[PDB]
Symmetry: D2
Subunit: 485 residues, 4 copies
Amino acid sequence: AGEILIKGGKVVNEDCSFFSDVHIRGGKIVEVGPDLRVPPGARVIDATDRLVIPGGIDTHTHMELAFMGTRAVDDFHIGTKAALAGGTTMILDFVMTQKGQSLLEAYDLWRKTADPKVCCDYSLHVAVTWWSDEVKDEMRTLAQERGVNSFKMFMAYKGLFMLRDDELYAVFSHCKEVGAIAQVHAENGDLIAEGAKKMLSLGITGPEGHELCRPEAVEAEATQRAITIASAVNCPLYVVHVMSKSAADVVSKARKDGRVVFGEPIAASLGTDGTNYWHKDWAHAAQYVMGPPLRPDPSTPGYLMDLLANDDLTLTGTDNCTFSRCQKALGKDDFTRIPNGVNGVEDRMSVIWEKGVHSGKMDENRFVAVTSSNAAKIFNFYPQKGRIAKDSDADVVIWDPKTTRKISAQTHHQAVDYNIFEGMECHGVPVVTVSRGRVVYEEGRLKVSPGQGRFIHRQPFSEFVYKRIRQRDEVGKPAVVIREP
Amino acid sequence: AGEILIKGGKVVNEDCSFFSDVHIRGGKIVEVGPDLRVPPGARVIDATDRLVIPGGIDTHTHMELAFMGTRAVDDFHIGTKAALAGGTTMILDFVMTQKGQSLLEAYDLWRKTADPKVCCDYSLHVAVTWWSDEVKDEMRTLAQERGVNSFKMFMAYKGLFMLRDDELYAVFSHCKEVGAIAQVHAENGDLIAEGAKKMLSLGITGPEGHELCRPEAVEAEATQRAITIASAVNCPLYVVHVMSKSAADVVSKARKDGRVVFGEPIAASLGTDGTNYWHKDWAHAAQYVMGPPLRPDPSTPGYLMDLLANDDLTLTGTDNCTFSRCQKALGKDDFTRIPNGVNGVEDRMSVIWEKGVHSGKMDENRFVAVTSSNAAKIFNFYPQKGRIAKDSDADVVIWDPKTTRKISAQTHHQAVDYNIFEGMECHGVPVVTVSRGRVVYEEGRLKVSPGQGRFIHRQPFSEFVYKRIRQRDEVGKPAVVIREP
Amino acid sequence: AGEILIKGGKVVNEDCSFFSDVHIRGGKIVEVGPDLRVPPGARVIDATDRLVIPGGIDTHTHMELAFMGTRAVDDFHIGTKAALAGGTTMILDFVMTQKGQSLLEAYDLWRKTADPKVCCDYSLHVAVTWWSDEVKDEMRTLAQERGVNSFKMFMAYKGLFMLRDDELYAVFSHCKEVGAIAQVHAENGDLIAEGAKKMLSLGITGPEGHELCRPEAVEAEATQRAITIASAVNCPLYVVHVMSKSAADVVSKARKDGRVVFGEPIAASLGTDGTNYWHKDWAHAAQYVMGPPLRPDPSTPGYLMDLLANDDLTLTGTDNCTFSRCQKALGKDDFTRIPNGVNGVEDRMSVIWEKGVHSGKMDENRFVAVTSSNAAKIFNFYPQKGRIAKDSDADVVIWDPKTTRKISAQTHHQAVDYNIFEGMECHGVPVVTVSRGRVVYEEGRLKVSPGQGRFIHRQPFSEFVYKRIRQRDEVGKPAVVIREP
Amino acid sequence: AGEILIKGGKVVNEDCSFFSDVHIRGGKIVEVGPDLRVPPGARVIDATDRLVIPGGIDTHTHMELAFMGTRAVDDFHIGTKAALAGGTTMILDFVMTQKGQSLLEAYDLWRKTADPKVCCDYSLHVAVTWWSDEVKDEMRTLAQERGVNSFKMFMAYKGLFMLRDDELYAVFSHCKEVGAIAQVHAENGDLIAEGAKKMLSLGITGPEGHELCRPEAVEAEATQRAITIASAVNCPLYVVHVMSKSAADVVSKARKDGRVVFGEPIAASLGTDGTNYWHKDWAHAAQYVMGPPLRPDPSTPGYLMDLLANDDLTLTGTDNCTFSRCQKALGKDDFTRIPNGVNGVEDRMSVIWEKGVHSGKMDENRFVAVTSSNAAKIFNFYPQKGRIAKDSDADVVIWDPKTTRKISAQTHHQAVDYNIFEGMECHGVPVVTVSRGRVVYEEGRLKVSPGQGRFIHRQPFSEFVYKRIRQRDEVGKPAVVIREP
Ligand SMILES: C[C@@H](CNC(N)=O)C(=O)O
Ligand SMILES: C[C@@H](CNC(N)=O)C(=O)O
Ligand SMILES: C[C@@H](CNC(N)=O)C(=O)O
Ligand SMILES: C[C@@H](CNC(N)=O)C(=O)O
Ligand SMILES: [Zn+2]
Ligand SMILES: [Zn+2]
Ligand SMILES: [Zn+2]
Ligand SMILES: [Zn+2]
Ligand SMILES: [Zn+2]
Ligand SMILES: [Zn+2]
Ligand SMILES: [Zn+2]
Ligand SMILES: [Zn+2]
């Protein structure tokens, strides 16, 4: 089996923290309590002066994605290893179906690519990048038989992934029918397309042109529009990579107004800012280029962290989609050709601890909710993951909140040859990572094999996402007025 | 010439009020001052205990518009007479060009229809309901040679007038090029189209279905999106008929954030509410049907009036587009077929005085700004109209703020056979209306002939609308960062 | 011992819901799991088609309080019985120390009064109604030795309980020193005092005068001021009975801005409104009189419920402080003499279920958080109460969410002879209440004895309230700038 | 008489701009029109390529005020000269009555000090720093016979000027009775007093301690509280020197909600920020010390300017209260002893033009409203000043908007030996200043004598401030409900 007893630490769940040992047997947590016996043969991890937390769940990755004429350098193998070294024990990666391509074929191609390579557990969202009867059927199959309750739609990427309002209305309606959550990349793709054209014509070909062609208003607008279409059909919505104060405030206002919408800032938008696009060194500026862009208002990451603490924003991913320096160089003369994407899978947990807990913005329990539990609740496997409790999966991180580590591309485990968080000194270090009941990272070294992680099959109609939707279907039906003809 | 001396009243301009007489000769105000001599032959209007104000300018009319299978019943003749009887001395009506139709032909057809019928002065906005090189040229001709500096675009009316984001971007860009303001009907036409389809399928065929298929979120969304596209191209924007709290707050927030946008609530949204669509009497409910709909939150008209007082909203029109009871009946089985449009041209001034000044929300001077002066400033003929001052046009109303009048279809001068403000007791009565230097309304009787009013030709680049736009063009150009290759 | 097995229900905690039976032995939940064995002698409660939830914790009561010249009619005995019949298993009542009176004496007097009468568990907050060295010491004693980590201060009740800003600053500073939370009744007592004087002078002596003398601005102002003083000293704050949209928005904004403040709406402000004060029947209007008053904007209770769902507001109490019809009549000629206080202890759970869960505003799990768990977290006994889990106290309610019950003073168990929620039909009925491991309410009948409940002694420095405060003390210290003299 | 013809410029009023010459005779503008004749003997000022604007009116000065143990160095003579050189032709200075001192004596002492020294026109506000029957009477005398319709109250300066809520309620009530506007210095004086005590105890004795002891929350709170008390008594309110985003947003929200409140940012808060208090050079940091402090958020002055453009904030003063370097040094060991006050009288017009008009935030006409016209409207002498029009006072500035000037203490005309705007390059230069019909500043040289300016006596009940107040008194009276006993 492999038995492990994590002894002497303080367990930290989303609700409260308490001292207790944790007994792991066979992939599962089988007991949580004080002073547990060490069974003969079991390995003891000494978690004295440490916190024992559910492993991080990164809701947003693109490992080895073919995009913008090249392929991301962190692949399923290296990317999941880097996750583990950074205290993340699950990733959820996007099946990026091409326009006119079968969603089932694209799903199968992702499972074939990832199944033999992942080092930690994972699951998949599926992008719906076009619409038709076939797509409709395949979404039902994916939700009922293939383990997927999240579909990803794009309002940006005109010509490539974009859907118009009438198509989003149909797609969101069908999400609600199959019990799936609708995820959206919310930027106005017409404004992006025109904006870029204008920045190029004015000779602004560098990364500053990338931010200036699609400033935060462009993200805030599409975010409000997605919310409005989703509310019209009573479909739950998930806005991925919220990058700006104004888009975050759209989400904040919609939630206060009782709309079923969740917002996901990412490690990049919580840990750094878009002033980097104006850096004199082209390579440096290019490293940060992603859609939607990081924003040049320096108060952004702190504000996003305050809203993450207060649950205006609810959980975190990384949008890990990495391109090395020579790949980013594809766009040296033309920002539109810089492959979009930044790093974060490995450093998300330390960045959020330093910028959110050490700073006093959120407590350790809210940290667990926004790095693991809420993802498990929304994507429908809580408390199987996201909670240190008997019968839960043994994906556990032993965490030192007092020690710092400096993030550097010289010491990171990602494939990419630079790091958007270079030089950041973070409190909060993953000292030991356990995945599926096995020690896969300890004493700064990984011990794991490609294919050791498993795909997690979820069911639709996640209760955290749907119980309000369903009650509103039952009491919120519009009524005719009764009238003489 | 016709000489008139208005004696003993208190003149009320947008800036301040003061006692003085007003001498009118030849269509113009030629002196303003205390104790003026009555020249032999001049008529004295005794304005003791009255206010002397610029005549109302209704920014938003559709006299005799062919629409939804019939033609509005208030035409240029009757509609302008009704305006005069209600203290409004100018209307600005929309040339509703059809898809694929020449803007110049449609403009000519409106001038031929209106020139021999109007009883008061008027001008025209031109709708841009499709896009092409021809449309581009014709907009330049209209702005430079035909007197028109306002173009009207629709985000609603899918299949009929609607433009997509990329077309709005081009159209707004060209507005800015020709020095015109971009007006928008801001509702999401895809959501309207789907929403109506859904209300019909559920058997909600009455007017309540019309409001429910396009609730205020649908107006607020498109309003934010228009603002965002206009801000992207630095084009000034004018949101016509703001009908809801949430859309008004979008405009309010954009202005505070320094966007060049103006919002226009109408008499309907300031004077009544959408609870009427739920009335047991179908005919009654149908009377209120227009796009965007009046809203069922009863706090709406008061809130819109508070924002009009505070200049979150800046000026007022009526969207006068009237259909008698037997025309509204076209939609007795299907709300989508009810011709959209309500009354207001005649009652706008009294409604706004009662709901805004008598209530203590705004003072008499702000009343003048939101009923005449701001319209003259935005559409580019201030202080020719909108101000009691020497050399200004003699379009003047003698106003009794203490007496009430009850609005009723039994006593109104509009062609329509009902009135959305039926029974409202309003303080503030137009006792005498002067248009082009002639008494056209007094002792409750009109004295005016069809064709007596003139088309007002405006120039582009109105300073109130463009001086900030032009300065931002000069200091707000994006700059490249200077970098080694 | 008394053993109980609650079988066949769905357990509902703040985090998730799941089918399982619950085994109670000796006052405690000793097992939670599927298909549990019934031990010989144990009573089975059949919870098929029911939810099994932690009993409600009412954070805010005033049982038998001597106030405004009389004494509340629901006393510790009747009041706790009524709580039980309504699915509430703990109350937290205010020790209302008089000006210049020893806090220790007042605490002792409350424990002597309540200990032999309560039918359910309870604890106490202590009011700090004056300040001095003695009060300082006694607060430390109360926090460290008497079980109390909450102190209540008043900005209203000039002459009676009010404290000025400089006294609030000192009191809040000392709360933070002893690890207590500062609770505040937030209305401007100078404006109340003047306002009432003015309403009386104008002959408005009825209950409408009570609301009009202290409209919502008066509550919103003091709420912002308390937040600002508490933030200045880094003391955690708890705003009790939030009664208005504007005060709730103050709390909402402060939380988004990362201030450690919690807001507590009560059953009255979630279930009805202040239009009642304008009722033609004086007695009826008087029934609703409390400070701060219910508000005449009908959108209030729904808005408060939306903010409770979204965690702008965090938990609920009742401010139960009841006066029968003949006691309310003390103020028949003068609203200032109407004893302030309404009912709610019994009906809070059904009111919140009907207005919050059945309406689709919050789900069953958020219902548990805002009726029990958050109170246990803030006042420092979670998960001892507020959670169905092994080792937790057996205070458990078997809840039917589908059946309705009509609230009426004819059928309620409170001592008061009317009910502010008279006639309300609520979904969600407590079918069986278990307190301390005993069935105390079932088949509509109570089975409990005075003194059967126990006082719950808490420790200071509740982690849910203090872990951010303490981290901010460690990294948020102001620093001198280093300068040459 | 002295006759002047200002020829060839563009006149800029609050409403619009137009080319015309301006004929000045005898202290007054006697004609405005194109191509005016030069009468023999008249001086022509050639205003080709210049704007002709009403002279600036600085609503907020403290010339030669004895304060904090010394006396401001810019006195009535030097201060008014410096005003003139900077295109400001009127100041309104505060009679700072001491606690227990007669308001009439203090007023007389100011008139005796200023009358023989001012070089431009001026008027006075009177501080009400204590309350009693005498103060009540003297306020009536001041409003009806001494020319003063503005009274200044302080919520800060505990022990020195502070008034409590109940005193503010009485004072504001009596302001409304005498037709005066209530001005407030809005910071919580208890929090200031405690905060300073705490910063000193922690060894933070430098200017950073001054900002940190009273951060923007402290200003925002008192600002909301003043608004709430003023709204309770229907008294018009004027918040002087709005220094922070959060206080400005309080004012913004109150106006949108229809409260009669005006907000006045000053040149300091529009032109620089509080990061200066952290400067390594003590003297430099001390230069900026005033109450309320400048704020360390760098986005502050731009935000205040956006709200000034949008009329959330309405007009501008300087709070000119200058102390030279050796006077500021009184507090070298203890920030509480640094005499509070900064410069601005001379540079206000250029700072606001550069930061507001050249930047594209407001147009030239809004510049006139926020630098002259609105002050004349609120303090009750419009259009006597604040407007280029026939019969108005000839206080006129010939303004070059295209040329820049660098502000420096080396070239300024103020008595103070440094300048908070040192080094700022501003577009917009006053080339010629005319005061009372005389050229007092031209070719960089002043030509004016002490005592040449006059005190301007105003009447109470300014219409811009009172017409809404009075209508609300007439329709907004609370009504009793009619009930059987
Ligand atoms: C495909 C993808 C990758 N990169 C990026 N967005 O910048 C995403 O849009 O989220
Ligand atoms: C055409 C027109 C007419 N009617 C209406 N909108 O309801 C308008 O949309 O403004
Ligand atoms: C004493 C008490 C009772 N009644 C009331 N407030 O109306 C409270 O203020 O909360
Ligand atoms: C007295 C005066 C002077 N200085 C200052 N406030 O910093 C004022 O408070 O406005
Ligand atoms: Zn994306
Ligand atoms: Zn992505
Ligand atoms: Zn329209
Ligand atoms: Zn229209
Ligand atoms: Zn209270
Ligand atoms: Zn209470
Ligand atoms: Zn001050
Ligand atoms: Zn001052």
